[PDB]
Amino acid sequence: ASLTEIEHLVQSVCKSYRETCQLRLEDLLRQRSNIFSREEVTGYQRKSMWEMWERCAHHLTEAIQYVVEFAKRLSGFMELCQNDQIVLLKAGAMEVVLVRMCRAYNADNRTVFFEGKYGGMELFRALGCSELISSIFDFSHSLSALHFSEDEIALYTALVLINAHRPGLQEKRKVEQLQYNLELAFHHHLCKTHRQSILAKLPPKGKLRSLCSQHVERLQIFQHLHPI
């Protein structure tokens, strides 16, 4: 693969993501000024754990569907053996959704677009694990510091997904092929955009893994055997 190819790989991932990103950044960034009232907050706080978990599971599902589309639009992905496509999406998509969150995170007021307005971590009081919720908030908060561009997310999350060190892949060598190809595409973009300085300050390897582990460690207790 020469560089002019690696160029197209960037261009592709970036297109693919631009279609599959759920909400336009403009929509999110405009909507920061729109925030839940204390009363509205209290309304969400007064819910059942069962109901907040029911909701959030729906939203997560809706999200995971977009990530499945993102993956489908990666050429190379579609070319991988059927089993492997699944193994990857199963370990990955969660972690991707987590990285995608930062776009909905507003550092200024430590809030996030949920069901139409922005709200802080205390909206999710009902799930009863402020600890996890706010480390999730922290994760997003530190990514917001990076001012992660849209193409950088596209490329990062692709790299979250394609990871030949997932247990269960049959065609490991094929996955590697893709994986390195995307690492080099990623390095290339950070040059073209003089953004090499962000690598050094990317989220610690599997601080992300640990955070999603913990989240499914809490989904499995309510939404047992649900498709995800």
| Nearest approach, Cβ of residue 98 and ligand CFJ (Å) | 5
What phi and psi, each to the nearest 5 degrees, are found at residue 165? -95, 30
| Nearest approach, Cβ of residue 192 and ligand CFJ (Å) | 28
Q: What angle do CA 58, 61, 62 make, to 5 degrees?
A: 85
Q: Which of 16, 106 has the CB closer to ligand CFJ?
A: 106
Q: Which of 88, 136 has the CB closer to ligand CFJ?
A: 136
| Nearest approach, Cβ of residue 155 and ligand CFJ (Å) | 19
Helix, strand, coil percent content, the chain, rounded in steps of 5:
70, 5, 25
Q: Which of 21, 175 has the CB closer to ligand CFJ?
A: 21
Burial of 64 (0-12, 13-18, 19+ CB in 10 A): middle
Secondary structure class of 222 (helix, strand, coil):
coil
CA 66, 71, 72, 73 dihedral sign is positive
Q: Which of 22, 177 has the CB closer to ligand CFJ?
A: 22
| Nearest approach, Cβ of residue 78 and ligand CFJ (Å) | 25
| Nearest approach, Cβ of residue 26 and ligand CFJ (Å) | 13
List strands edge to edge, sheet with 117-119: 105-106, 111-114, 117-119
Alpha-carbon gap, residue 200 to 179, rounded angstroms: 19
Q: Which of 107, 184 has the CB closer to ligand CFJ?
A: 107
Q: Which of 101, 158 has the CB closer to ligand CFJ?
A: 101
| Number of other residues whose CB lies within 10 A of the CB of residue 102 | 21
CA 74, 79, 84, 86 dihedral sign is positive
| Nearest approach, Cβ of residue 114 and ligand CFJ (Å) | 4
Positions in the binding site for ligand CFJ (CB under 6 A): 22-23, 56, 59-60, 63, 97-98, 101, 104, 112-114, 124, 133, 136
